[PDB]
Amino acid sequence: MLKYIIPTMMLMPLTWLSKNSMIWINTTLHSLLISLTSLLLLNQFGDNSLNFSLTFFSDSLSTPLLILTMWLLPLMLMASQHHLSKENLARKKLFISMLILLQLFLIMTFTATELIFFYIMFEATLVPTLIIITRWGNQTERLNAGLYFLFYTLAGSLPLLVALIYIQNTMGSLNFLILQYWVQPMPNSWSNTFMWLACMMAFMVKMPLYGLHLWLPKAHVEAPIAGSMVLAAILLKLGGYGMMRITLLLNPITDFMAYPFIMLSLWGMIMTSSICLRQTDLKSLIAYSSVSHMALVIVAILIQTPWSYMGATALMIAHGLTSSMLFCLANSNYERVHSRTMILARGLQTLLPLMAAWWLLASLTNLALPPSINLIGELFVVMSTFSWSNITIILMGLNMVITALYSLYMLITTQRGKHTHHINNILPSFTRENALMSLHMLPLLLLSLNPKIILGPLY
Amino acid sequence: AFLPSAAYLTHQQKVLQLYKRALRHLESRCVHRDKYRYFACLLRARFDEHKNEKDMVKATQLLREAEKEFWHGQHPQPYIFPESPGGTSYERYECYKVPEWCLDDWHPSEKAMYPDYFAKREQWKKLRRESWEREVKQLQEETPVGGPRTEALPPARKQGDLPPLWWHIVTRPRERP
Amino acid sequence: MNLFSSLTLVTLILLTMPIAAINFNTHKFTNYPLYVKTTISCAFITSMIPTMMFIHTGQEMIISNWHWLTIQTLKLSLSFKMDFFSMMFVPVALFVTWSIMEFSMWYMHSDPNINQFFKYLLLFLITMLILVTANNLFQLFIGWEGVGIMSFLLIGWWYGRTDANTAALQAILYNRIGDIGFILAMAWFLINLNTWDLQQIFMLNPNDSNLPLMGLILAATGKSAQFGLHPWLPSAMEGPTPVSALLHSSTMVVAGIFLLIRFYPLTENNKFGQSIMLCLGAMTTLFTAMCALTQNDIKKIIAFSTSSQLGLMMVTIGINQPHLAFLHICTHAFFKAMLFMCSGSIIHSLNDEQDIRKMGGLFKAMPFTTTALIIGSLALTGMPFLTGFYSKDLIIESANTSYTNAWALLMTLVATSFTAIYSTRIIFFALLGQPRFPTLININENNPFLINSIKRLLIGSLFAGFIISNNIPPMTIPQMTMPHYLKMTALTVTILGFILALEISNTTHYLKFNYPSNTFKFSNLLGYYPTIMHRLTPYMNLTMSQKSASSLLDLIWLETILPKTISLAQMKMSTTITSQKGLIKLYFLSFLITILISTTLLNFHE
Amino acid sequence: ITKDMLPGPYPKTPEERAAAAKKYNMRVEDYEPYPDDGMGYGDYPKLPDRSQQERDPWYDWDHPDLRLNWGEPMHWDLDMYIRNRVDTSPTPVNWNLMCKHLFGFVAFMLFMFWVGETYPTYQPVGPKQYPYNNLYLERGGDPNKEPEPVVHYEI
Amino acid sequence: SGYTPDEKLRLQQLRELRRRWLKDQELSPREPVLPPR
Amino acid sequence: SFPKYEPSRLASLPTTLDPAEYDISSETRKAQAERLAIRSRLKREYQLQYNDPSRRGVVEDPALIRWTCARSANVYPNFRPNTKTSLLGALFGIGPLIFWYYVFKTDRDRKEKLIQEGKLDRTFNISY
Ligand SMILES: CCCCCCCCCCCCCCCCCC(=O)OC[C@H](COP(=O)([O-])OC[C@H](O)COP(=O)([O-])OC[C@H](COC(=O)CCCCCCCCCCCCCCCCC)OC(=O)CCCCCCCCCCCCCCCCC)OC(=O)CCCCCCCCCCCCCCCCC
């Protein structure tokens, strides 16, 4: 994995030694070169994971998250270069440094062979995210949002530290490859109950779990566009990655510990989606949609059937692409009206037709239109949870109604109807913005041709 | 109720609006033109019966029970004109009513496609921006203290002035673009 | 094998070619609608060859040409099923769509998004032929959601109009409520039969098929606009007239009926599903034909007409006669598409007038439209040996002569009378009588697009029931022995409908005014179902979406219990610790109390 | 925008109520806040819960699709009372009478389908008769077993 | 009683400017000026 | 005589059938004139900015900003935990969680009891 970590670190001299007008073009070019290089991780086998060293390996779960992560950096650089154009050159280089450093932490978070190194990188991802939100966020509430984002994650994860060090003392190792073969069944006790909670609640917060999700409609909304892209597209999916790693060590206790949390998700996706029907802030509507979509990933990991893991990792990759594009579309209208009120700018298909078509495609992938990998993940999770209990389809199916309802209302409020009269600074769509939308949507639609690469280690 | 100039509906205006709505809902009930013609003259006779009532209390009472009469006897799906609010073609072409300022954001390769149109548009924008300060100082010298009482706007007073707040009435899009 | 499968796939690839043309364009077109119309005419000509060589031998096959994805035992492939249903439905859909697009080359001619319109309409056709030629549930679900999304994009065509966007989101709402049951059926077949392919579903032949058939009936209720999930189809007339003619009369709305026809080996062994389909389709064909008796908007009348015919299709599925139902689909496409085309020709000639109380005198004024509208209404009501006679009459001859829910039979016959009543309502208010439209007569229909497009479906509505019903092979045994009152039932009830509604029509010429009774207000306000359930069920959702979910839980209580209580606790303990007066006496007195508690109270010196 | 033009706490003195009504651009005798039970409304006005469909459509509105003006105090549920959502407009038949008619019609239809299912119609014939022991091999019977002899006779 | 004389004068002046605008929406015989194909 | 119109929550009373529409008293005249005055002032203040050629941007509506601030930010500072909010938060918050918990727990206890006893038909079930 050292053929990826070293170019990501060489992106630091590539942004701090660049000419003052070349610091976006060079970082975009070489980050796209790293993203083209990321395809070598697709050397996956049906039996063995691509095991590099004592420190790094990459199975078919971590590989699509890595390719999405290394792809997301050029898209964040294209997204965040317009509103940081009047910024000081040193703070501009510091912003690019925080994005590069966050990618650097993420690519060795997903390839951590050992779990306490996973913890160190997993909590290392807080600090560039916290600095990006609380420094380049636009409104007043970025400080409070950074506080909530920091202290939900740390309060969930400092018991995870004690739990992982307890596994290191008990089993002898926190290598995942060793613990595939030295896993002991976890019996029923209160000690093993709080063992389970300490191993799970950090990732429950990072997914987020319903009831614990209060950081997210502040952290995703008060962030800048690159912060919202990396928080929605990757940093939620650390929780699903970590749960899929750590429920190896939590059997058969998960079979009766998952019962409340599944309820919290199966009801939570009914609530948060319903919250999306009454959100006046468009960016908050996309945030609660992200909560509603990650509730299915929580359910699928907690029922721990193969169809559920295949659908959950397909839903993670698909929601990363779709939610990143929806935040970028909301930014494309925020850079024209300078407000996030959804009812303010209306009728935008009369003025911006191709950008309305990008809104249309992002809304159709949001509502899981087949054969998108959104629908492949959604459908496979629904199959596995019908196998879990035959009544859950009601909570699934009603969700698939409400998920349609706000996905098109967002399309009807913003793009359709009569245009707002007094708003006259609606510029034509830049080539940069349509490039951003196309680089989100075209990989998402190409993955419908060959979806087996985003279906996880048990395809 | 809700009018831009008047703060209310007078009794005479309420009687006229009830008369128009009664004839329209009756015509919805009375599809054919001769049958509607007969019953519309009968309804005109009913309106011309109590025409000369001088007691405003008694007249308001008669208007109120006539509204009760109408609400009991209205068509459930009345006739609506196509471009009328509730019709089948109402606000249909609002997706083609592009505002004028979008023409300011064209590329020069498509502005040069219409040279006379934009060369004629520049003097519209010129006339607008040199009429603007005169009509603003017209509005702030004629409006009473405490704000304008009604939503009515004054006309132009001089020979050379344009009427105040005129641009989004003159340069509104056509109803069939 | 080499001719059949090749021209089968050539039809679909040919239909996808103008999508590549409109996506790979630079220029202004040399009549791209003519290009799409020529493409669909060529697709009809191409698809007739596999249909004729199916009529010869009964030659069926499956083209599982592209392996897509293997989920451990579920090998999803790009698999096209060429059986009786695809071989009969693809040429009918292509012929009707070719007529609708030559209609649209005249009707939508003033639209500056006409290439976008023909693009969307061809995308609808591609998704629908994906639906009907599908072999597994995933590909059928692709076509299912595709025709739903193109229904959204074509109801909300004039998107600045609020009512079009409202009706489009309404149609999506009811279709996704049906999709709940569709995905329920897919879930049941994967978990209990390890398949989405129809062949393994049919060969395993499950007995406990209550739940998946309930899911499929719910899917057909949502997609084919049965009762409970009906109002989106009359709402769907808010789009343009060729959208209502192609999608919402003949092609999209029969997809739930097509879904229950496709699973006929599972319905011919489940009597409970047959009774549920029978009662539901009889309820729909009663209620929608009753609502059509009093409507004044002509597209709403023809929309309740096609939903009543869908209810009759659900009835004849429910009496275990699926091939009569599919024959009635292929029959119904012709005259119902032509009724919408003639109504839209009236609408265009009268300057977007759709209310029938401003029509009339169009007998001699629009004579070809008059002729084709009369032929379409006679085919709808089952005039003998027009196309609607060759299925619908036989349906009644099977609905009477079978072990049947008798209330469903009586409501089916009352629906059959109501078809005659609203058909002569259309002919009486649109064609007969005197003018009621305004005084600037611009009545004109002399475009060869309009004339030829109604002409081909007119020849279809004359001869297509005869041609198809003689060319198809027998799949059941037709019940042909029955008494004279039971053979003449449909024709007698239809003639009674015509006579009674002529009496009702001639009562309107009198100079007598009656108050509207509760039956007229019930049938005129759509059984009160779009009035209550579109005001109450959104209300009960959206307050629950804000007063309970948004504000109360995730802005107050889940925000109260974890972060705010802990934050106030830490603030309060911080203000109690650091509230020291700086006095040295008090600190050393606390040290003495510390040493006394450490010795006497905790025994730290032991 | 500034602080004293943003919503604040619930008004309890009449001068704070007058300042609230001046803030929300409406008359003090027309200004009615939500009742202080602690639901987070604050000083926000309780507008009388009318849909935007009920507004006068012929008026020259500032926002014609919303039927709403500039500076006009929006309803708390303005996202809910748009013309794409919940309509409170008056109906020619009473609401309770509509519910009576709809529930009575649906219940009568369900009861009569149950009556028709309990007493079904049929034809005055026997059962359909099939050869080869009621088609034993065709229905999927195994040939190593042997069914009971189903024999039909002439009549 | 119809319009006031102020309202009549305003509608006449707005009518004149509106008809000037709508007449100036017409095309020249040289427009559209197309590129050399 | 005629059946009187019954207004509902979702079917309001018409303006024509309303008695308080017909108030010819002078205090209602002053109320209607004062509302016309406020609406005329806001209309003038809007369309002075709206017709300005120098303006190229968003005419900011403090009513809309005020509404979006009231829907989100002012909810918790004007929350008081009392009997009504506690009962509605415990009835609507942990109520359905308990409900769906007992439903899914009872269903899975029933299904596991049928499977481990050899009752549930799990014949072709090999995808899970
Ligand atoms: C590996 C090689 C692969 C080669 C083949 C590639 C296959 C397709 C890949 C994805 C294509 C997306 C690009 C087009 C859409 C986005 C841009 C756009 O809108 O442009 C408009 C523009 C034309 O319109 P315009 O008038 O100029 O402007 C638009 C107007 O303003 C007004 O706009 P509008 O709204 O009127 O028009 C938009 C319209 C709006 O229409 C819709 O939104 C309706 C679509 C949904 C319903 C119908 C489809 C339902 C599903 C059925 C189809 C799938 C299954 C079929 C298979 C058989 C059955 C199983 O959409 C279309 O016309 C698109 C038609 C195709 C739709 C495909 C499905 C997308 C729906 C959302 C996701 C669904 C699930 C995933 C499906 C993935 C399929 C691969 O198109 C272009 O300029 C095209 C430029 C070139 C595009 C290249 C795309 C591939 C790039 C990949 C590069 C690397 C690989 C190399 C291959 C390169 C191939 C050339």
Ligand SMILES: CCCCCCCCCCCCCCCCCC(=O)OC[C@H](COP(=O)([O-])OCC[N+](C)(C)C)OC(=O)CCCCCCCCCCCCCCCCC
């Ligand atoms: C984001 C906010 C929510 C975060 C939730 C985090 C998880 C919730 C539960 C955490 C419990 C504490 C960590 C447990 C680690 C268990 C490791 C282990 O070996 O356990 C077995 C051990 C058992 O000891 P042992 O393993 O040495 O015993 C040998 C084995 N037997 C039992 C056979 C003899 O458990 C313990 O010793 C104690 C476990 C419970 C600890 C209770 C104290 C903490 C209370 C909860 C704090 C929760 C977070 C607080 C902050 C909230 C926000 C401000």
Ligand SMILES: CCCCCCCCCCCCCCCCCC(=O)OC[C@H](COP(=O)([O-])OCC[N+](C)(C)C)OC(=O)CCCCCCCCCCCCCCCCC
């Ligand atoms: C205008 C240009 C047209 C093409 C010009 C170039 C070709 C010219 C004509 C000569 C033919 C060329 C040789 C033949 C083609 C190659 C043959 C071959 O073996 O191809 C390899 C394979 C054949 O399948 P396969 O089984 O060998 O490989 C599948 C791969 N595995 C086994 C790993 C899963 O692929 C193709 O043929 C690809 C094209 C397929 C065509 C249909 C694509 C539909 C896309 C839908 C996406 C979403 C579907 C979701 C739902 C699916 C159903 C559930």
Ligand SMILES: CCCCCCCCCCCCCCCCCC(=O)OC[C@H](COP(=O)(O)OCCN)OC(=O)CCCCCCCCCCCCCCCCC
């Ligand atoms: C085989 C068995 C068959 C059984 C059939 C019966 C079962 C289903 C029972 C009925 C459920 C659906 C009907 C109720 C909801 C209908 C909502 C709807 O369509 O609202 C339309 C409304 C605008 O309509 P309208 O006013 O007519 O438009 C013209 C404009 N003047 O638009 C709006 O007001 C916009 C609203 C947007 C938000 C929608 C909120 C409501 C969502 C409801 C979801 C219900 C899911 C139920 C799932 C059950 C699964 C078991």
